[PDB]
Structure 1
Amino acid sequence: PTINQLVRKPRQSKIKKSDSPALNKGFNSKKKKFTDLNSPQKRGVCTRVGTMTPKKPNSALRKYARVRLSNNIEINAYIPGIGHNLQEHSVVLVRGGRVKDLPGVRYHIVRGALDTSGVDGRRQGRSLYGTKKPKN
């Protein structure tokens, strides 16, 4: 803890990397290179539906979504809830980041969000997987 060589030679900070690096980004075609944006809002347009089986910690069954973002790369999602949207090819409002217990996926759906409304079997949630005009 000696200060001579401290202006001769400095120190570092910690070492951390931020969250969702292949997110918060809008891929170019005119100038071909991405934008570092951290946008509030964004879209999702669909390529498949997707589902993998081996689930230990829950040990029930539920699928997810394989939705591609701009212009030739693998981007993957998951539908956290009791609502099955047996759909695809949508145009939505993204939710950024991952919910607990799925590795590598960081992209999601807001309730409603211009494509569908949601799993309409919900009426008590009034704020989960599709819930609009709910008597409070």
Structure 2
Amino acid sequence: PTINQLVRKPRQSKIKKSDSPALNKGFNSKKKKFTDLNSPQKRGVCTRVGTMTPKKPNSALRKYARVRLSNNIEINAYIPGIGHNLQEHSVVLVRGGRVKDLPGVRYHIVRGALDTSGVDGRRQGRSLYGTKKPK
């Protein structure tokens, strides 16, 4: 562009879509419209608990759950680790981060924190998974 062209119309940059977009919203219950927060975790309550099958080459039966959050948006969230204990109407803390195989799953359920428990016999990165130190 010549310098007159960049003075009439100037250069504009591009915008950042997030990942994780349902963590950037909160709900004002009384005025009754959404609000913006940028929180790192949100609390939810689970409305299903099942398993999906992965994609292109992979293969397994992968445990996941549908959970509606504090603002009232609903999402699927992968349950990590090996065992679990979720039912209907459990209270989970959810966190960012997508699982690549599953289409359309893009949150993770923090193990350790609310109703969810740590994993049952883990010893080596035990603070993901949160389990406590044996003996």
- Range into which the TM-score falls when normalised by the shorter chain: 0.7 to 0.9
Point out where structure 2 has 5 or more consecutive residues left out of the alignment. none
Give 1:130 shift.
Answer: 3.2
| Structure 2 residue aligned with 1:18 | 18
Is the alpha carbon distance of 1:38 and 1:128 closer, same or farther for their aligned partners in structure 2, counting shifts above 3 Å? same
Is the alpha carbon distance of 1:8 and 1:78 closer, same or farther for their aligned partners in structure 2, counting shifts above 3 Å? same
- Displacement over 3 Å in runs of 4+: 53-56, 70-74
Question: C-alpha distance in 2, partners of 1:88/1:123?
Answer: 29
1:3-56 residue CA offsets vs partner (Å, 9 max, x unmatched): 112111112213441222232322232122212111133212111113233544
TM-score by length of 2: 0.78
- The 5 A counterparts of 1:29-40 are 29-40=29-40
Report the number of matched residues: 135
Give 1:66 shift.
Answer: 0.8
C-alpha contact 2:23 2:39 (8 A) present in aligned 1: no
C-alpha contact 1:83 1:129 (8 A) present in aligned 2: no
Is the alpha carbon distance of 1:54 and 1:94 closer, same or farther for their aligned partners in structure 2, counting shifts above 3 Å? closer
1:33-87 residue CA offsets vs partner (Å, 9 max, x unmatched): 2121111332121111132335443212222111112466432111133233343
Query: After the TM superposition, which of the residue ranges 113-122 and 123-132 deviates more from structure 2?
Result: 123-132
TM-score by length of 1: 0.78
| Structure 2 residue aligned with 1:98 | 98
Query: After the TM superposition, which of the residue ranges 120-129 and 36-45 deviates more from structure 2?
Result: 120-129
Provide the secondary structure at the position in 2 that maps to 1:39: coil
C-alpha contact 2:79 2:108 (8 A) present in aligned 1: yes
Provide the secondary structure at the position in 2 that maps to 1:102: coil
C-alpha contact 2:20 2:106 (8 A) present in aligned 1: yes
Point out where structure 1 has 5 or more consecutive residues left out of the alignment. none
Q: Percent identity?
A: 100
